[PDB]
Amino acid sequence: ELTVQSERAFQKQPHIFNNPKVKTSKRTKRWYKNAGLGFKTPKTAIEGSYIDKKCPFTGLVSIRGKILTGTVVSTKMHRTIVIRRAYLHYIPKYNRYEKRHKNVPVHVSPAFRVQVGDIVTVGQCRPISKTVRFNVVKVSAA
Template sequence: MSSQVEQNERAFQKQETVFSGRKRLLGKAARQSQLRYSKSIGLGFKTPREAIEGTYVDKKCPFTSNVSIRGRILRGVVLSTKMKRTITVRRDYLHYIKKYNRYEKRHSNLSAHVSPCFVVKEGDVVTVGQCRPLKDRHLQRRQGRSPGRHLGRQEAVPSFLSRAVPLA
C-alpha cells in the first residue's frame, strides 16, 4: 500500500479503514488490486472520481474517511485558498431593518476543509456541508464547486429544508 499512496508528509500516510499489513500467499498469482476506502455521503452528492481512484490520504475527507455530513448545507463564494486544505467562504445575505422597512447587505465568512479531490480557485461558488467540529475553526466541509467568478450580486441561498443542492 505504501507504493500506491502519496507519501509527502513526515508521518507514514495510510487510510485508517484499510489494513496494510496483509501477508502475501506463496504460490498464488499476485493481484494488482488497489486497497482504497471510499464511500457515498448521500444527500444527492456523487462521490468524485478522484476520491475513488486517487492516491491521496485525508482523514477529514467525507468521501475517504470516517466523517459524516449532517446539519446545514450552505453555499458561498471562495474568498481565500491560502491555507493548506482549507478555504475561506463568504456568504452574502440581506438583513431586514424593521424601523426603516428596508434591507441591508451583510456577509459572514466561514472556514471550510477542502478535500484534495477538488481543485478550487478564488471566486468559485461552492456548496458546503456541516459536520462535526474538525478543528477549532473548521466547522464546515466543502462538497461541490461551480466554476465562474463572483460578480458582486447576491446569490439566492437554497432552502435548508429541501436538502436538494445541485452539485455542479
C-alpha cells in the same frame, strides 16, 4: 497529493490493509463512501492517492448538518478555504435591507480543485479544527 507520504508519519486510511501476500491487481486498496444527500462521490476521490482523513468521501467525517453555499475568497491555507456567505439583513423600522456577510472556513478535500470565485456547496461536519465545521461537497465552479 505529491508523494502522499510526504509527512513525518505514514499516511494511510485506517483499518484498510494492503495484504502483501495476496497478488491483487491494484495492491493499493482504497476506501471511499457515498456522502449522501445526492452529493456525487468525485472520480478524483474514487481513484486518488491522497489520504485526507477529513474528506467527506475518503475520510472519517460525515455530512449531517446544514448545507450552505458560498463564494471562495481564500485558498491560502492547506486543505482549508474561506467562503464568503453574502446575505441581506432586514431592518424592520426602515423596511429595508443592509448587505451583510459571514466568512465560513471550510475544509476542502484534495478531490476538489477550488479557486477564488468558484461558488461551492459545503456540508456541516463535526468540528475538524478551531474554526472549521464544514466540508466542501460540490465545487460548482461558477
